[PDB]
Design a protein around this ligand. Structure first.
Ligand SMILES: CCCCCCCCCCCCCCCCCC(=O)OC[C@H](COP(=O)([O-])OCC(O)COP(=O)([O-])OC[C@@H](COC(=O)CCCCCCCCCCCCCCCCC)OC(=O)CCCCCCCCCCCCCCCCC)OC(=O)CCCCCCCCCCCCCCCCC
Ligand SMILES: CCCCCCCCCCCCCCCCCC(=O)OC[C@H](COP(=O)([O-])OCC(O)COP(=O)([O-])OC[C@@H](COC(=O)CCCCCCCCCCCCCCCCC)OC(=O)CCCCCCCCCCCCCCCCC)OC(=O)CCCCCCCCCCCCCCCCC
Ligand SMILES: CCCCCCCCCCCCCCCCC[C@@H](O)O[C@H](CO[C@H](O)CCCCCCCCCCCCCCC)COP(=O)(O)OCC[N+](C)(C)C
Ligand SMILES: CCCCCCCCCCCCCCCCC[C@@H](O)O[C@H](CO[C@H](O)CCCCCCCCCCCCCCC)COP(=O)(O)OCC[N+](C)(C)C
Ligand SMILES: CCCCCCCCCCCCCCCCC[C@@H](O)O[C@H](CO[C@H](O)CCCCCCCCCCCCCCC)COP(=O)(O)OCC[N+](C)(C)C
Ligand SMILES: CCCCCCCCCCCCCCCCC[C@@H](O)O[C@H](CO[C@H](O)CCCCCCCCCCCCCCC)COP(=O)(O)OCC[N+](C)(C)C
Ligand SMILES: CCCCCCCC/C=C\CCCCCCCC(=O)OC[C@H](COP(=O)(O)OCCN)OC(=O)CCCCCCC/C=C\CCCCCCCC
Ligand SMILES: CCCCCCCC/C=C\CCCCCCCC(=O)O[C@H](COC(=O)CCCCCCC/C=C/CCCCCCCC)COP(=O)(O)OCCN
Ligand SMILES: Nc1ncnc2c1ncn2[C@@H]1O[C@H](COP(=O)(O)OP(=O)(O)O)[C@@H](O)[C@H]1O
Lengths: 56, 40, 107, 459, 320, 347, 54, 98
């Protein structure tokens, strides 16, 4: 029954929501370490005509 | 079949005035339950 | 000695409850048959079916990030080049001597 | 990494708002789901590491231990489901909370790019374990066992804090990458000797080394089942992981500072293997077996050769899984028998055949049978020690023979022979115990197909 | 605004409410006497408030619903079993005696709180004082051991060193054969098993010890069975006597404030009734205590605070 | 006593401490100490009894001797340099005598003997005030002249204090004496970092005050004085026992609880000054504090001691008076490690 | 098993520590509560600090 | 540093030793405290008057006042002790112990 199983099975959504939040936080934290993107002496590459960043 | 829990004999160890009783402190008495001494 | 010889008031030690006596097909999970059966189902499905098989296949087919085939190809090219030109294969000095500077002793 | 840490944290509100009769199901399902997420970390590269951020990084040494840690929790829940039947809802939720906190602390410990954070979580892993041992323990000696486990660890690990802050004051950073790249030799001086001792003793006490192992039989015997498996499987590997991480700055002093510990371990392996032969208890026997295996791991780490490190990692994982299985089987026997004595119940193979099969498989794996990863790690360490000195083979072979002897003695005394007459409560084994044994053993026989996943960074 | 130091600071002075009519009175008598009838008449005539004698389930009447709880959850003792088997092996006699003494202490605290809060006096049956006579009767008859009376004396002295003795003590005297005949007439199946020696011990423990101790510091009105029927003379005697020997005249506003803070907050009142001395009659094992407490928590209005019970019917929970 | 008089005496104690902390004259500091001592005595004697009187007279004798020593030190300092401002002492003998005076006021060993007895005689409320509030004036005075104190004397007194607190805490059974020895050991820890960094001293003082306030409020909530009276608590309010065990684990220095923040940080500071032996010794000594805290936790919460029948009646009544700031104190004393860098606020 | 693990290894590290700490606790905590001895010790330590640390 | 100051500090030290000796008669302890206070007053007065530190002439009087107050307080406590024991021997205060 809708709106009845929710009051008993709302706890199951907690862990996957936490996983998605963790993935988002990991990407956001990775966004702060772009001080050498496409500046590495080994992977220094000329950008593609329709490319703005080497990686996200 | 039952988890062991302390009995009276185990509890009496902490009932003294001090731990590790010795000869000198064998005659010490625990303070009264309320901090009031007889007027004598 | 009119002492009761009872040190304290205590419940008698209860006897172990057999899970099969009141419920055959007991699965050893819970005394409530429906919750018990569903616990068995989810344990078997997420343990064997989902993790132990899909995860095993995922680990089996992991991309070669350790660069084993890349190292094999590089070694093949190096060996071919050094054999064709008569170079002595592996070199004793890891780093070329000219770049390195050794402090003079004069002792 | 936060994709792993965050769900483990969310396990707590998930458990605390669950219904009174559905906590075990939810905890088991979501713990298994978390383990699947942790599988992604295993794909390491031959280069440096998976540097996730400034606080967490993953290597090919941390990946197998992390996967094992995440995998152990569902097994702990299934093991604890038995003896917590008559427990109130609040106390069961507190037990699951302690297990979840232990897993979270271990997960944060194993990456811990900075050494002070590693130490903080390495000591934080001590509170939930002590609470579990001293609260949900059957015997009256659980209190003394908890005190021993706390103080043996803390006395060793307290000088480590001083050593670490001193290193930070002189070196200037405790980040493991900077520590590895800027490492400099340690001169032969009394101050450097004591720095070596401070940095090493904290991990050698937890492994444990022979002569400081007195806390382990007590902690393993008096603890509940889940505490026993988490002690034997993961908590023993903290010392070895820390030692292999920290030996990068102790060279070349170790070249001669390893002699006392090498001799102690190479003799204590024989001593504890012999002790296992004359034992009246099952859990004590398994604990002493764990001591022997960890002594071998200590020898391997102190040798400091690539084959030593590979064998050490393989033996770590294999011994964790095997000891967890053996403790599970002993607990299943004890639940029916209620005595915990080896010779009180005999001939159980006639009454419980499948559990006899599980006993045989666990004993064979403990016996270091090829091509299981137990023997892979064993043999790698044997070859490395042989390269170290040709005379070690005598001690190692003696240990192997005694290990086989006591493993088959454990199997024969409890499984073969005529059944005891005055025991008539040996009920048929539940599906839960069989599933627990299967989930313990199948990963071992699966990892024997892909050894490179557990051979460490020096593969 | 519940009573506290702030209320005393602003307006609450309890010496104004006392109007010479308070006169806390305890009516004490032998088993199956006419004191209960007499106490009711005194309270009716003098305008005071009558407190019925504290029983096993007295405390259950003041907390939550007045309906008594199960015997296992409140008292763990029964009077009928004491009458049937006075020398019961499981130490029922002491457990009954202690539970009754603590119930009487709670009743005395409640009576003092009512007197200090309102100013209207109270009438009581056997108080914490005179309760020791039953203990003496049990001990001399051999029902309880010496350590038993030692523990009772310790608890009694600790608990009673902080309360004001009653203004007037009224005693109804009935000879032993007469009360034996009254017991036979009563018809309660357990009560004819009361031995004459037990009643004699109760009476001479009353007369030899309790009465002189009350006389030396209070007013004593010894009444026979006949002369206690006429409540008019009793009330006239109550009015005629003047209280000038007890501690009550020496009390002031500050001491009354301290006493009023003590009588409320019943936890401190009952704090010393559970001193950690382990007699086999009163001590309870860990498993039994855990099981009984868990069963107590499952009661309808006992899981949470009084105002925070959903099953009882308390609403607006999430805003209180 | 009258509530107004009690409030006035408490205000006078706080005013004396404030006068000590906010004044720049030695005479005014001595006046503040005298006012504090004068108003603090009736607080010990609120519940009149022979034990309270004896504790109060011991406290008065010790404090008066300390004040006289402090005044003599001030006089000598004035003699050898005509300065009244609280600054460099300008004299070794005056500094030594003032250090002993402030040690007597604080309770550092070997001037520690009065603390256990005074704490035992007086009530829980009086003890709570004495244990935390009293420390603020002498510690402020010591922080103001830390550049002149002799490191040898302060360090040896701190080491002796830690040793004595750890050893004496093992034997005691009453909770008040355990708290007194715990305070002695914590002050031995805290005064050892005075010559190096006073900010660490202030941080340790704040953490210790929070922990001991929480523990004393928990002890007042469950009216227990001896160990067995505390063991009986689990049958009525198990939550109190659980919170008390968590706070006890925090007070032992176990990470990641808040009580680990000071010690760790303090060690760090003494490692910056090439002092290695002493921090190790103080850590291995604090292991003893941990031991007797663990014994108390075993007695209180981790095991269920036998109960009493009359306790049933206590199940029906609720705690009428609730003390505010107890949950805040527990949280601040248990879960504030991740905010360690906030110590840069020069708290 | 018995002689090394259960007897001497126990005697060296844990049991010796327990015995020493118990003896020290008994020695330190055994004070009769007399302030005469307390203040005599105070005088002794005042003299010691006056003549030693200067 | 002339001999007068040396003699005053010697008197203070002697009074402190007498206070810390504790034979009996807590009244003697209070007397020793007040002897220490008197020595402090004399020394401070001499130091302040010698250097013509005019505004500091307040210091002795203030000192005396406060110290005398403490003496009064002490006496009160002593009285109560006697009222509980009948005499003021120091050895009677042994209920509290470490
Ligand atoms: C030889 C290869 C065979 C390959 C065929 C495929 C087999 C797949 C099996 C996978 C693992 C088995 C799972 C373990 C639990 C078993 C479940 C159970 O309860 O059984 C009840 C079930 C039904 O019986 P029941 O009547 O209902 O129950 C009554 C009682 O249980 C009474 O029970 P019981 O009396 O019938 O005894 C149970 C039986 C079964 O229980 C076991 O002991 C099985 C576990 C044996 C391993 C012991 C640990 C040592 C480490 C080996 C690790 C290798 C793993 C490789 C990858 C595995 C992938 C999962 O135990 C034994 O028979 C003794 C085993 C000792 C064998 C020693 C030799 C080991 C090394 C041999 C070479 C391996 C590598 C080859 C490399 C070179 C060649 C290419 O019986 C079976 O299913 C028997 C299975 C067949 C036995 C396999 C033993 C050897 C195979 C090992 C892995 C294969 C290697 C790949 C090579 C392919 C070519
Ligand atoms: C960093 C800083 C660290 C602070 C150190 C620790 C501070 C602890 C000392 C505070 C005073 C102790 C206390 O209140 O009782 C302990 C108290 C336990 O409460 P309790 O056991 O129910 O009180 C029993 C009293 O004996 C029952 O006392 P009562 O029956 O005499 O009732 C009189 C009551 C009621 O007061 C009144 O009646 C107000 C009338 C005003 C009269 C105006 C006269 C002024 C001229 O006044 C008081 O209780 C004292 C309040 C003093 C005002 C402080 C501002 O615990 C705390 O107060 C914890 C304080 C939280 C920490 C401090 C702030 C957070 C940082
Ligand atoms: C009951 C009676 C028997 C019935 C069964 C009959 C069938 C017999 C089959 C049983 C064994 C026969 C051997 C057949 C082996 C073939 C498969 C093998 O070759 O694949 C392995 C692959 O297997 C996996 O690598 C091993 C499993 C991964 C281990 C993870 C465990 C699962 C997670 C659970 C938690 C783990 C806890 C411990 C953490 C460390 C080796 O991989 P590799 O040869 O290179 O190449 C793979 C393909 N490539 C080329 C594209 C790369
Ligand atoms: C025929 C096929 C045979 C092989 C089948 C293999 C199937 C493998 C399934 C198991 C996968 C194991 C879990 C892997 C988790 C690690 C990777 C994970 O963290 O990645 C996240 C992504 O995860 C996926 O989105 C979700 C996968 C979760 C589910 C896996 C499939 C099985 C789930 C089963 C759940 C229960 C099923 C229903 C039961 C009732 C975040 O990725 P992100 O860091 O952004 O990537 C950045 C790089 N980009 C930009 C290129 C992407
Ligand atoms: C009990 C269970 C196990 C616990 C842990 C056991 C491991 C701890 C053992 C410590 C390892 C070795 C310590 C010192 C090693 C240095 C080598 C030294 O011992 O040999 C000679 C040193 O001579 C003497 O040994 C001097 C030290 C003697 C005093 C030390 C105590 C010896 C016995 C105490 C045993 C107690 C161990 C357990 C304590 C609880 C060489 O003389 P020299 O070449 O000139 O000096 C070398 C050092 N230099 C180069 C820096 C100058
Ligand atoms: C548990 C940790 C302790 C918590 C303590 C209680 C928290 C609540 C206190 C409420 C605010 C405190 C002060 C109120 C603000 C106004 C007062 C302000 O003007 O004072 C300033 C100073 O502000 C305070 O010092 C900072 C108070 C902040 C205390 C928290 C630091 C704790 C660090 C570790 C725990 C992290 C926080 C955990 C949650 C609170 C002036 O500084 P200044 O007069 O020029 O220097 C004097 C100090 N000297 C003499 C040494 C130089
Ligand atoms: C400088 C000094 C350094 C001090 C180092 C402190 C080490 C920390 C452990 C101290 C524990 C001492 C307490 C003690 O043993 O008391 C005796 C006590 C009596 O039992 P109680 O419960 O107290 O009383 C109940 C019966 N009435 O004896 C016992 O039972 C001991 C049980 C637990 C013992 C645990 C010992 C584990 C220590 C292992 C070695 C670590 C030592 C630390 C220093 C290492 C050496 C450099
Ligand atoms: C299960 C119980 C195990 C107990 C383990 C305890 C022993 C651990 C080893 C010693 C711990 C203390 C070492 C100090 C921490 C390291 C800090 C450091 O390295 O700094 C040194 C300082 O070295 C020291 O100060 C060491 C002093 C040691 C004092 C404490 C002694 C403890 C016991 C010593 C013997 C124990 C050794 C064997 C223990 C075996 C286990 C029982 C450098 O000094 P600098 O000031 O920089 O000088 C440079 C200018 N020349
Ligand atoms: N401390 C006690 N021990 C045993 N019984 C008690 C105790 N206190 C009260 N009682 C019981 O309370 C009952 C009522 O007392 P009583 O006044 O004699 O009868 P009634 O209420 O009809 O006048 C009596 O049967 C008496 O036994």
């Amino acid at each position: 029954n809708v709106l009845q199983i929710v009051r008993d099975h709302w706890v199951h959504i907690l862990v996957p929501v936490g996983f998605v939040f963790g993935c988002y936080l990991d990407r956001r934290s990775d966004e702060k370490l772009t001080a050498f993107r496409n500046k590495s002496l080994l992977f220094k590459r000329e950008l593609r005509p329709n490319e703005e960043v080497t990686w996200k | 079949a039952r988890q062991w829990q302390p009995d009276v004999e185990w509890a009496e160890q902490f009932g003294g005035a001090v731990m590790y009783p010795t000869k000198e402190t064998a005659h010490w008495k625990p303070p009264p339950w309320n901090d009031v001494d007889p007027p004598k | 000695p009119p002492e009761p010889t009872i040190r304290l008031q205590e419940d008698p030690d209860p006897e172990d409850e057999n899970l099969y006596e009141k419920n055959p097909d007991s699965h050893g999970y819970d005394k409530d048959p429906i919750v018990d059966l569903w616990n068995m189902r989810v344990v078997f499905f997420f343990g064997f079916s989902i993790v132990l098989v899909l995860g095993s296949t995922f680990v089996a087919y992991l991309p070669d990030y350790r660069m084993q085939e890349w190292a094999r190809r590089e070694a093949e090219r190096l060996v071919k080049y050094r054999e064709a030109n008569g170079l002595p294969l592996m070199e004793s000095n890891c780093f070329d001597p000219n770049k390195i500077q050794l402090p003079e002793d004069e002792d | 990494m936060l994709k792993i840490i965050i769900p483990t944290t969310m396990l707590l509100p998930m458990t605390w708002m669950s219904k009174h009769n559905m906590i075990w199901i939810n905890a088991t399902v979501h713990s298994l789901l978390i383990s699947l997420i942790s599988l992604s970390l295993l794909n390491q590269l031959g280069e440096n590491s998976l540097n996730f951020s400034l606080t967490f990084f993953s290597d090919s040494l941390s990946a197998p231990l992390l996967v094992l840690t995440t995998w152990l929790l569902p097994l702990m829940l299934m093991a604890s489901q038995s003896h917590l039947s008559k427990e109130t809802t609040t106390r069961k939720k507190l037990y699951i909370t302690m297990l979840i906190l232990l897993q979270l602390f271990l997960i944060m410990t194993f990456t811990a790019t900075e050494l002070i954070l590693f130490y903080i979580l390495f000591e934080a892993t001590l509170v939930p374990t002590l609470i579990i041992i001293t609260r949900w323990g059957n015997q009256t000696e659980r209190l003394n066992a908890g005190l021993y486990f706390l103080f043996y660890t803390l006395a060793g690990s307290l000088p480590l804090l001083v050593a670490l802050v001193y290193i930070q004051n002189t070196t200037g950073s405790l980040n493991f990458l900077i520590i590895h790249y800027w490492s400099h030799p340690l001169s032969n001086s009394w101050s450097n000797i004591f720095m070596w001792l401070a940095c090493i003793m904290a991990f050698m006490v937890k492994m444990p080394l022979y002569g400081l192992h007195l806390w382990l039989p007590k902690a393993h015997v008096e603890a509940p089942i889940a505490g026993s498996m988490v002690l034997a499987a993961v908590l023993l590997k903290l010392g070895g992981y820390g030692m292999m991480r920290i030996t990068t700055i102790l060279n070349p002093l170790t070249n001669y500072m390893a002699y006392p510990f090498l001799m102690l371990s190479m003799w204590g392996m024989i001593m504890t293997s012999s002790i296992c032969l004359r034992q009246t208890d099952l859990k004590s026997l398994i604990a002493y077996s764990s001591v022997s295996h960890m002594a071998l791991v200590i020898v391997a780490i102190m040798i400091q050769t690539p084959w030593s490190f590979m064998g050490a990692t393989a033996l770590m994982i294999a011994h964790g899984l095997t000891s967890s299985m053996l403790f599970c089987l002993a607990n299943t026997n004890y639940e029916r028998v209620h005595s915990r004595t080896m010779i009180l119940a005999r001939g159980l193979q006639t009454l419980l055949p499948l559990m006899a099969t599980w006993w045989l498989v666990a004993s064979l794996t403990n016996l270091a049978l090829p091509p299981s990863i137990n023997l892979i790690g064993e043999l790698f360490i044997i070859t490395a020690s042989f390269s170290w000195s040709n005379i070690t083979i005598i001690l190692m072979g003696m240990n192997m023979m005694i290990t086989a002897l006591y493993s088959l003695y454990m199997l024969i005394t409890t499984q073969r022979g005529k059944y005891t007459h005055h025991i008539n409560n040996i009920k048929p084994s539940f599906t839960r115990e069989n599933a627990l044994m299967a989930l313990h053993i199948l990963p071992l026989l699966l990892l024997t197909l892909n050894p490179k996943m557990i051979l460490g960074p020096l593969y | 605004l519940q009573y506290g130091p702030l209320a005393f600071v602003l307006g609450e002075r309890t010496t104004r409410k006392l109007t010479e009519t308070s006169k806390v009175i305890t009516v004490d008598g032998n088993i199956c006497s006419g004191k209960g009838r007499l106490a009711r008449e005194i309270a009716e005539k003098l305008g005071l408030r009558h407190f019925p004698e504290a029983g096993i389930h007295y405390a259950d009447s003041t907390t939550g619903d007045g309906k008594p709880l199960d015997v296992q959850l409140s008292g763990n003792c029964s009077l009928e079993k004491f009458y049937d088997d006075p020398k019961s092996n499981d130490g029922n006699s002491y457990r009954l005696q202690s539970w009754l003494y603590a119930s009487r202490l709670l009743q005395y605290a409640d009576a003092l709180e009512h007197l200090l809060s309102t100013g209207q006096g109270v009438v009581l049956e056997r108080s914490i004082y005179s309760d020791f006579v039953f203990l003496e009767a049990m001990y001399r008859q051999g029902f309880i051991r010496k350590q038993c009376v030692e523990h009772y004396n310790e608890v009694k002295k600790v608990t009673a060193c902080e309360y004001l003795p009653p203004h007037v003590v009224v005693y109804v005297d009935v000879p032993v054969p007469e009360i034996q005949s009254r017991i036979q007439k009563k018809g309660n199946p357990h009560e004819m098993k009361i031995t004459a020696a037990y009643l004699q011990d109760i009476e001479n423990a009353y007369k030899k010890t309790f009465l002189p101790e009350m006389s030396e510091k209070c007013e004593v009105l010894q009444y026979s069975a006949r002369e206690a029927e006429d409540a008019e003379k009793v009330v006239e005697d109550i009015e005629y006597l003047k209280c000038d020997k007890g501690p009550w005249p020496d009390q002031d506003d500050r001491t009354f404030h301290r006493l009023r803070m003590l009588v409320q907050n019943k936890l401190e009142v009952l704090n010393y009734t559970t001193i950690p001395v382990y007699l086999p009659e009163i001590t309870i094992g860990a498993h039994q205590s855990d099981r009984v407490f868990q069963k107590f928590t499952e009661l309808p209005g006992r899981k949470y605070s009084p105002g925070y019970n959903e099953d009882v019917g308390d609403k607006w929970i999430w805003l209180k | 006593m009258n509530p107004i008089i009690y409030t006035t005496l408490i205000m006078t104690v706080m005013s004396g401490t404030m006068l000590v902390m906010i004044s720049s004259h030695w005479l005014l500091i001595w006046i503040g100490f005298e006012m504090n001592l004068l108003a603090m005595i009736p607080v010990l004697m609120k519940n009149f009894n022979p034990r309270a009187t004896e504790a109060a007279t011991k406290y008065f004798l010790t404090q008066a001797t300390a004040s006289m020593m402090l005044m003599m030190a001030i006089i000598i300092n004035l003699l050898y340099s005509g300065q009244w401002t609280i600054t460099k002492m300008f004299n070794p003998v005056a500094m030594t005598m003032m250090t002993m005076a402030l040690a007597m006021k604080l309770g550092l060993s070997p001037f520690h003997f009065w603390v256990p007895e005074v704490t035992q005689g007086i009530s829980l409320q009086a003890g709570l005030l004495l244990l935390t509030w009293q420390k603020l004036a002498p510690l402020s005075v010591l922080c103001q002249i830390s550049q002149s104190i002799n490191p040898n004397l302060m360090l040896t007194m701190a080491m002796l204090s830690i040793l004595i607190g750890g050893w004496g805490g093992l034997n005691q059974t009453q909770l008040r004496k355990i708290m007194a020895y715990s305070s002695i050991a914590h002050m031995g820890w805290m005064t050892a970092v005075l010559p190096y960094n006073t900010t660490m001293t202030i941080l340790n003082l704040l953490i210790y005050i929070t922990m001991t306030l929480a523990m004393f409020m928990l002890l007042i909530h469950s009216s227990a004085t001896t160990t067995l009276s505390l063991s009986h608590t689990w049958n009525k309010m198990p939550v109190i026992t659980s919170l008390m065990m968590v706070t006890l684990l925090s007070m032992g220095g176990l990470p990641p609880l808040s009580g680990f923040m000071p010690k760790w940080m303090i060690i760090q500071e003494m490692t910056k000054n090439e002092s290695i032996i002493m921090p190790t010794l103080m850590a291995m000594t604090a292991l003893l504090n941990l031991y007797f805290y663990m014994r108390l936790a075993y007695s209180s919460s981790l095991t269920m001691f036998p109960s009493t029948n009359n306790m049933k009646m206590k199940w029906q009544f609720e705690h009428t008076k609730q003390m505010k700031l107890l949950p805040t104190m527990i949280v601040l004393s248990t879960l504030v490690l991740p905010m360690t860098p906030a110590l840069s606020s020069l708290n | 098993s018995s002689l090394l693990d259960l007897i001497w290894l126990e005697t060296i590290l844990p049991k010796t520590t327990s015995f020493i700490q118990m003896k020290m606790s008994i020695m330190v905590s055994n004070q009769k509560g007399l302030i005469k001895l307390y203040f005599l010790s105070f005088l002794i330590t005042i003299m010691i600090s006056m003549t030693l640390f200067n | 540093m002339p001999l007068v100051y040396m003699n005053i500090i010697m008197a203070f030290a002697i009074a402190l030793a007498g206070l810390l000796m504790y034979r009996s008669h807590l009244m003697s302890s209070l007397l020793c405290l007040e002897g220490m206070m008197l020595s402090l007053f004399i020394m401070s007065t001499l130091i302040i008057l010698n250097t013509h530190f005019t505004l500091a002439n307040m210091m002795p009087i203030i000192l005396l006042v406060f110290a005398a107050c403490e003496a009064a307080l002490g006496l009160s406590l002593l009285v109560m002790v006697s009222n509980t024991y009948g005499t003021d021997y120091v050895q009677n205060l042994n209920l509290l112990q470490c």
